[PDB]
Design a protein around this ligand. Sequence first.
Ligand SMILES: *[B-](O)(O)c1cc(NC(C)=O)cc(C(=O)O)c1
Ligand SMILES: *[B-](O)(O)c1cc(NC(C)=O)cc(C(=O)O)c1
Ligand SMILES: [Cl-]
Ligand SMILES: [Cl-]
Ligand SMILES: [Cl-]
Ligand SMILES: [Cl-]
Ligand SMILES: [Cl-]
Ligand SMILES: [Cl-]
Ligand SMILES: [Cl-]
Ligand SMILES: [Cl-]
Ligand SMILES: [Cl-]
Ligand SMILES: [Cl-]
Ligand SMILES: [Cl-]
Ligand SMILES: [Cl-]
Ligand SMILES: [Cl-]
Ligand SMILES: [Cl-]
Ligand SMILES: [Cl-]
Ligand SMILES: [Cl-]
Ligand SMILES: [Cl-]
Ligand SMILES: [Cl-]
Ligand SMILES: [Cl-]
Ligand SMILES: [Cl-]
Ligand SMILES: [Cl-]
Ligand SMILES: [Cl-]
Ligand SMILES: [Cl-]
Ligand SMILES: [Cl-]
Ligand SMILES: [Cl-]
Ligand code: NA
Ligand code: NA
Ligand code: NA
Lengths: 469, 474
Amino acid sequence: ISEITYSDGTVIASIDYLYFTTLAEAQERMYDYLAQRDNVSAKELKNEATQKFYRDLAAKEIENGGYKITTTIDQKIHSAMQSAVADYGYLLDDGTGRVEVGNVLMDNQTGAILGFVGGRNYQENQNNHAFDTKRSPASTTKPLLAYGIAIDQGLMGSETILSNYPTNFANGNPIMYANSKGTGMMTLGEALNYSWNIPAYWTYRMLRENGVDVKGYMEKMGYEIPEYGIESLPMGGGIEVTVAQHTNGYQTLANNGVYHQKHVISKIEAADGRVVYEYQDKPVQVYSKATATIMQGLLREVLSSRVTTTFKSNLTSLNPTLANADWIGKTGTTGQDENMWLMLSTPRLTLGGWIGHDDNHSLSQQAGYSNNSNYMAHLVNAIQQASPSIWGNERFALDPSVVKSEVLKSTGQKPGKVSVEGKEVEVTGSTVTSYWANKSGAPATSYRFAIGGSDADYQNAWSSIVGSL
Amino acid sequence: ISEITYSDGTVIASIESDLLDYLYFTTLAEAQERMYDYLAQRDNVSAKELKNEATQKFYRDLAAKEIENGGYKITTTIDQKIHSAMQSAVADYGYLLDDGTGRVEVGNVLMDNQTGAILGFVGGRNYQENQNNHAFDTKRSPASTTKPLLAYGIAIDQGLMGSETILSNYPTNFANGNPIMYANSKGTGMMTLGEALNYSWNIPAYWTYRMLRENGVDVKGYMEKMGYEIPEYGIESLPMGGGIEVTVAQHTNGYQTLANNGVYHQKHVISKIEAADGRVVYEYQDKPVQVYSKATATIMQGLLREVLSSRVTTTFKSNLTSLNPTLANADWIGKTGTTGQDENMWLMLSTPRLTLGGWIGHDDNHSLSQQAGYSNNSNYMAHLVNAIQQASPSIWGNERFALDPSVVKSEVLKSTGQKPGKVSVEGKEVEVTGSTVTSYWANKSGAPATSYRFAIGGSDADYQNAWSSIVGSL
Ligand SMILES: *[B-](O)(O)c1cc(NC(C)=O)cc(C(=O)O)c1
Ligand SMILES: *[B-](O)(O)c1cc(NC(C)=O)cc(C(=O)O)c1
Ligand SMILES: [Cl-]
Ligand SMILES: [Cl-]
Ligand SMILES: [Cl-]
Ligand SMILES: [Cl-]
Ligand SMILES: [Cl-]
Ligand SMILES: [Cl-]
Ligand SMILES: [Cl-]
Ligand SMILES: [Cl-]
Ligand SMILES: [Cl-]
Ligand SMILES: [Cl-]
Ligand SMILES: [Cl-]
Ligand SMILES: [Cl-]
Ligand SMILES: [Cl-]
Ligand SMILES: [Cl-]
Ligand SMILES: [Cl-]
Ligand SMILES: [Cl-]
Ligand SMILES: [Cl-]
Ligand SMILES: [Cl-]
Ligand SMILES: [Cl-]
Ligand SMILES: [Cl-]
Ligand SMILES: [Cl-]
Ligand SMILES: [Cl-]
Ligand SMILES: [Cl-]
Ligand SMILES: [Cl-]
Ligand SMILES: [Cl-]
Ligand code: NA
Ligand code: NA
Ligand code: NA
């Protein structure tokens, strides 16, 4: 009778979060294997009755067969993660009841899942918040769906300027962030650190205007998103993901643009040793190396800046060496504080983390900012203790293909002549290196130098700019 | 022969004559200052004679001899378990300060808010390597930790602003024509007190101090009640710490005053000297002074609570949270400091029971790294605050700072920090309206009606520009 092992061949069980997660995945691979073995047509496989039967026939196969199921799970690491959430999960409770939690640690280079947190305590609550739970990824959407795609397309670079000026949705309601209706122009860096919404709204809207196949990108990463025609899409509206699937997105950015499909099972072998399933590596360059490495740079500072997450502070206090790893990441917070995300990467690993309530009520305001950040610092340390060089010491680095431009700070763009209602101006001032992922680098400065902005906005910004020579 | 004891009576050391450790020198030195004052007054020397240098030297010599040969018991306020714990903390965690500019030195004073007793201190990285006492001897500019005491606290006390009053942070020059800078920023716009505190902007502080001069406020009087020695008050950048130099111990005494509801207790490390024959030659006398009203102090507490919790200029609450979440939930308030070339970092922390002063920098005054104060010092002091807890788990207390009853509350416009009402904007009189906030004052009657110059500071151009904005939003 059959076995599931850790990656080193150590038996997990013969046929708790660990048990069911790995088994359910093994059964899903067994389901595929049998449907292909019986030549079940794709029409047939859509049939509900057929699915039940084959779901049931895969389950019995594992029980009765004598298969070895090799998982990707690292015993020391996964176990250290269980202790972590046991020891430190209480840091999440903030007076809104018992806060649940999902984490997935993924190898950036393989997609393998080394260990995971399923929830506060399987014995109290059996919902798997790492693999099953689907929640809006909120602002963690932005680097993937908006900004990363805009850069990859050549429509934006590291120090391009976006409008966070007040603006409304089609219905007339103001696009909000926290309680702000917006401010003014702003670099991509600042838009990312503070997690503004308006800048993301204009970015997505620009992608639609340029006809960019955004679905194409998201699908290459395994994202199932049913409707792309949504103005708040890039802020995580109309999207729902597992922590495992979402971790896979950040795995893509971290792995210099190259997707590896997540997996928890690497091999199933019949009792006579014939492989019935084995994981096939299909790297996929979702973003250009320039794009991914440019994005790595920005997400480095999302964490450094500490604007929306205290994480680096927390990690520094618990483990100052570890804190010097080249961490990058992105927070998410849903509009009523229903869900907090913190996504973290070093060159080697990605660790995704969600918290919230099962019934979807609000957390405290600081639940993502402080609590989750603190918790994940403890979790990241606990993985370190268990496997001391697993995080690695590599730095993320700009790909040589990255083009570097001299732009004005004020416009995001090369200095140049511009007309400001009549009066042409020679536009001059302090400059910055901007990183682009196109052939040619930044354009020269135009009147509409920014992503988004009304006319009014533009004669307000140009006002100050002109003032400032 | 003579002995210096911890506060429970344990012996720290014997004083006998020499042939021809911070704790020894610090406690002995203050004991000799006491013996000095005693011997002088026993002999009826007057401030006339005691101004004469041959006479000081005589009475300093006499006080040394007296403790060396006499049979005095000297009782210090030092708490042995806590002080030890602090020596351990700097030993274990001092390296957290080293940022690549060399060996960063450090001074700390833990003070009891209710008496001014010093319970323990850190004198430097390692007395062996360097004997400069950075807790008691080194004087440095308190930088922006000047602002609550010299500027905003006094303004509130004098009824010239309240908790949500607006201040100008629009660009402006010193009298010589140079811009008042903060980091690289030439300024922004109008600003609540709270925001001005959390970011530690300079211009609001500049204007605040200017106001107090225009109003002839006795700022020296306040600072002196707290033991501060500032030689020259006519200095534009005073409130930012310009032309001020202080020990960690003196400066801890200033934050003690705000923390103890406005009431100052003079710092001391010695509570009693007693002779063998029963003669008490010195015993510390409790002499509370109300420097700020309880209203002012408790309002200030609320603002300093958020300086820490906003995490703008320090990571401390984050650091402490990860080290000791329960302790991070005590009622911490504080203020940071950074001199203009990054030479000096300060963090001043209080709970209702204790104040902990912290300075870091280099004995030769060269620059620290840019984040030394924001991050390094904040992290170290969270380690230090925690180590103090471990040694004495109730010492910090679970009490909360709270507004005194005497605090006046007012409904004001968020835009103007003043009560809603009509204003004359450039000819046409306007119905100044919008969302409100509760603002705390330490006067009789609270906020005024909004006037054209609602803010502390600002030029005509500035006020135009800001009203421009406010009129828009109606
Ligand atoms: B983000 O910082 O997680 C974020 C995302 C949104 N998106 C949507 C669709 O509401 C809103 C907000 C916010 O207004 O706080 C933040
Ligand atoms: B403060 O945030 O510690 C502060 C204080 C000063 N003071 C003086 C006298 O220059 C300057 C600055 C600064 O230029 O950043 C900050
Ligand atoms: Cl293993
Ligand atoms: Cl920023
Ligand atoms: Cl699409
Ligand atoms: Cl999905
Ligand atoms: Cl569509
Ligand atoms: Cl799998
Ligand atoms: Cl077999
Ligand atoms: Cl950092
Ligand atoms: Cl922080
Ligand atoms: Cl280039
Ligand atoms: Cl260029
Ligand atoms: Cl191009
Ligand atoms: Cl317009
Ligand atoms: Cl000394
Ligand atoms: Cl003691
Ligand atoms: Cl603020
Ligand atoms: Cl004065
Ligand atoms: Cl002084
Ligand atoms: Cl004067
Ligand atoms: Cl005697
Ligand atoms: Cl009073
Ligand atoms: Cl009242
Ligand atoms: Cl009122
Ligand atoms: Cl009054
Ligand atoms: Cl003017
Ligand atoms: Na966020
Ligand atoms: Na060191
Ligand atoms: Na400061």
